[PDB]
Every structure is written in C-alpha cells, then in structure tokens.
Amino acid sequence: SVLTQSASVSGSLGQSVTISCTGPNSVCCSHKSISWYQWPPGRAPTLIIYEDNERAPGISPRFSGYKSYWSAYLTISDLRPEDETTYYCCSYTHNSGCVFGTGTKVSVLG
C-alpha cells in the first residue's frame, strides 16, 4: 500500500542483494519499527528481522537490517540457492498493527 518497497530485484549465488522499504511520514520510519517477512507464495511465512536490525531465532547471520530516517533496508549476504521468494516489510509500533509492504521478488538464477 503506502509502504512502497523495491518492486523486484535479481541476484546471483554468493552475492548480496538489498530490498528497499519506504513510505510517507505517516508510516515510515524514524517513529516506527520495521519487520521483514520471507513469504513463499501463499504459504507459511517466516519472521526474519524485527525492531529494525534484530534477527529472529534461527535466522542465519546473512540477513542484516538498517533503518534510516526515510527508508528501511534488508540485505541478504551470501546468496544461497534456497532464497527465491517474495520479501515483505511491515511498519509497526508497540500498540499498533502491521502496515505491510508492496513486496519484492528476489531471483537467484545463476
């Protein structure tokens, strides 16, 4: 919706990608946390990264986060083959809900 992501980006094995996540001042970013979700097509998602740069349990140290005053970034260091899916970002605070993003499909064809 208002949280415009990075449309779509491609990659290659061993390299690192970057997904954008930015919106207007009403949802992003310095006064809101950002969460990143690996979401297979209409299946069971996975919380990767919460409270800007904090990683969920079991998340490989490849995924790193970074939130600026204007846009939040999700890096995927060292692309492994099992990475092709759609990544969503959500803006939230402590007593609110998830303002999901527009999605970004990542390809690893190499």
Partner: protein, 128 residues
C-alpha cells in the same frame, strides 16, 4: 515452538460468513497474542487484527473492525509451560474481493516493543 493448525478450505459465496479455526499446542496459549493476516488476490498481504487470550482485549485495523468476529477459548493446560488453545475468526459482509489465504499467528514476545508481532504462523485457509 508449537503448531497452529487451522481449518479447511471452506468456499462459500458472497453475503455469508465464514468461521476459521486456529488450534494451538506446544506453547502456553494465554502468553501470546493471536494475529490474523490475509493475502488476497487483488492486493498484497493485509493485517486484520490480534486478540490477547489473557487480557481478552482486541485490536484490529479500521479496514476490518466492522467485519471481523475475533474470539478465543480458554486453554486446557497440558504441562507447566504448555497448553492447547483455540482462536476463532469470522468476517461479516463477505465478497469476492476477500478471496485469499488466511492464517493465524502467535505473537513474538511477552513484553517489550514487539509483543504482538506475528511470529509463529499456521498453514493457511483458502476462502471463497
């Protein structure tokens, strides 16, 4: 670290209401919120709302407040730190625009700034 199994693919038609179940296990059900999230065809994913099984309190987006029935049972304790819960979801004015996969999601923590964050999900239910 438990499962959140849901109901089946109950495909109805506009006008009616649909009740979707969410039976928990493996974790203390009253310690984490149950978020409801949907990914329909026509939009992306949309956050519907979460409900606190302990406080009985409900918070849901204004896009679904006048549509969603969100209730919960009371856990049947299994062990000291385990239980089995049940969360129910309904929608009022149902259309073809609400066709999509629906999931429940246990909250992340019991305190802090990411308490209700949808962390542990179910498997999905295909609507109309």
């Amino acid at each position: 670290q438990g499962q959140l199994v849901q109901s089946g693919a109950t495909t109805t038609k506009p006008g009616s209401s649909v009740k979707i179940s969410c039976k928990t296990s493996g974790y203390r059900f009253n310690f984490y919120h149950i978020n409801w999230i949907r990914q329909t065809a026509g939009r992306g994913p949309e956050w519907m709302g979460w409900i606190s099984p302990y406080s009985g309190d409900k918070n849901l987006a204004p896009a679904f407040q006048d549509r969603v029935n969100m209730t919960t049972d009371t856990e049947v304790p299994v062990t000291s730190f385990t239980s089995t819960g049940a969360a129910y979801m309904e929608i009022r004015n149902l259309t073809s625009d609400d066709t999509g996969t629906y999931f429940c999601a246990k909250g992340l923590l019991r305190d802090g700034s990411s308490t209700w964050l949808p962390y542990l999900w179910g498997q999905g239910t295909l609507l109309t």
